[PDB]
Design a protein around this motif. Structure first.
Motif, PDB file in Angstrom:
ATOM      1  N   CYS A  12      -5.858  -1.055  -1.233  1.00  0.00           N
ATOM      2  CA  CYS A  12      -5.665  -1.462   0.143  1.00  0.00           C
ATOM      3  C   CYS A  12      -6.993  -1.596   0.887  1.00  0.00           C
ATOM      4  N   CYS A  33       0.827  -1.233   0.000  1.00  0.00           N
ATOM      5  CA  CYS A  33       0.000   0.000   0.000  1.00  0.00           C
ATOM      6  C   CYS A  33       0.856   1.276   0.000  1.00  0.00           C
ATOM      7  N   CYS A  39      -0.192   3.398   3.509  1.00  0.00           N
ATOM      8  CA  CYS A  39       0.104   2.871   4.852  1.00  0.00           C
ATOM      9  C   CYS A  39       1.260   1.857   4.893  1.00  0.00           C
ATOM     10  N   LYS A  82      -7.520  -1.269   4.012  1.00  0.00           N
ATOM     11  CA  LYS A  82      -7.672  -0.361   5.154  1.00  0.00           C
ATOM     12  C   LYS A  82      -8.038   1.069   4.766  1.00  0.00           C
ATOM     13  N   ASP A  83      -7.487   1.562   3.658  1.00  0.00           N
ATOM     14  CA  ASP A  83      -7.585   2.995   3.325  1.00  0.00           C
ATOM     15  C   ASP A  83      -7.894   3.300   1.862  1.00  0.00           C
ATOM     16  N   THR A 113       1.258  -1.326   4.292  1.00  0.00           N
ATOM     17  CA  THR A 113       0.959  -2.742   4.561  1.00  0.00           C
ATOM     18  C   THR A 113       1.180  -3.527   3.277  1.00  0.00           C
TER      19      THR A 113
HETATM   20 ZN   LIG Z   1      -3.156   1.011   3.212  1.00  0.00          ZN
END
Ligand SMILES: [Zn+2]
Ligand SMILES: Nc1ncnc2c1ncn2[C@@H]1O[C@H](COP(=O)(O)OP(=O)(O)OP(=O)(O)OP(=O)(O)OP(=O)(O)OC[C@H]2O[C@@H](n3cnc4c(N)ncnc43)[C@H](O)[C@@H]2O)[C@@H](O)[C@H]1O
Ligand SMILES: [Mg+2]
Length: 217
Positions: free
Chosen positions: A150, A130, A133, A152-153, A135
């Protein structure tokens, strides 16, 4: 909770680090991340580091120890820390011992994440990261929920510049040379714990929790 992760390129240090930080609440210190951030900014340190990093070679010990000493001097490290990918030479390990003796923050465990070398090429070449972030995912072993973004975001995934086959081959040769001496260094200090990194991600983390859940202040 003063922890070091070691392991060959692709073994799963960053994947485990993200889970240790989330579970135990200690800051992540990654020499890889620090260098790549400095590269992106194109600072003198970054421009010096880039030359080594691009070839899959280790950045010189002196600059490396310096940035880690600096990071550890920050207030947040008082509660503990998770060093990821440092030390990776015996000279770095010796300097770390001395720094942490001065700071009164000796290592609890060095966790060595073991994966058969024959697995590591595919780990790295199939890796997607990502951009927001940092990850990591894997197109085969750990894909995102939506391809290219990603979980998460929503950030766009990318391939790390050093994850090309030619650079991976070099990175593996360089770091394999270091494995026996570092293991011998820390086995001596009685802080070395081996974990089987050749399992499902949650199963490797299960084994990490056995070790880190045992620590009591
Ligand atoms: Zn991310
Ligand atoms: N101390 C130091 N001294 C000198 N120079 C230094 C230095 N530190 C850094 N440098 C320089 O900076 C460069 C980069 O260093 P650094 O960023 O530290 O890279 P590295 O040590 O090669 O490790 P990677 O991030 O490549 O892999 P990882 O083990 O963290 O794997 P991940 O969890 O992402 O997982 C890999 C892939 O596998 C997947 N995966 C993870 N776990 C599993 C699993 N259990 N099963 C299946 N797939 C999995 C992931 O999703 C991902 O796709 C170095 O080459 C060097 O030039
Ligand atoms: Mg990593």
């Amino acid at each position: 909770m003063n922890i070091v992760l070691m392991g060959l390129p692709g073994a799963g240090k960053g994947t485990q680090a993200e889970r240790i930080v989330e579970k135990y609440g200690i800051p992540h210190i990654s020499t890889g991340d620090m260098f790549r951030a400095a590269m992106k900014e194109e600072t003198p340190l970054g421009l010096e580091a880039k030359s080594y990093i691009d070839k899959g070679e280790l950045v010189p010990d002196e600059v490396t120890i310096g940035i880690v000493r600096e990071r550890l001097s920050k207030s947040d490290c008082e509660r503990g820390f998770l060093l990821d990918g440092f030390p990776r030479t015996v000279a770095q390990a010796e300097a770390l011992e001395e720094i942490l003796e001065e700071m009164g923050r000796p290592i609890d465990y060095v966790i060595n994440i073991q994966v058969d070398k024959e697995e590591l090429m595919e780990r790295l070449t199939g890796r997607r990261i990502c951009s927001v972030c940092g990850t990591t995912y894997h197109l085969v072993f750990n894909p995102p929920k939506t391809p290219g973004i990603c979980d998460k975001d929503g950030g766009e995934l990318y391939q790390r510049a050093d994850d090309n086959e030619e650079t991976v081959t070099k990175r593996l040769e360089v770091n394999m040379k270091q494995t026996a001496p570092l293991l011998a260094f820390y086995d001596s200090k009685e802080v070395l714990v081996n974990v089987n990194g050749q399992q499902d991600i949650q199963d490797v983390f299960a084994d990490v929790k056995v070790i880190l859940g045992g620590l009591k202040q």
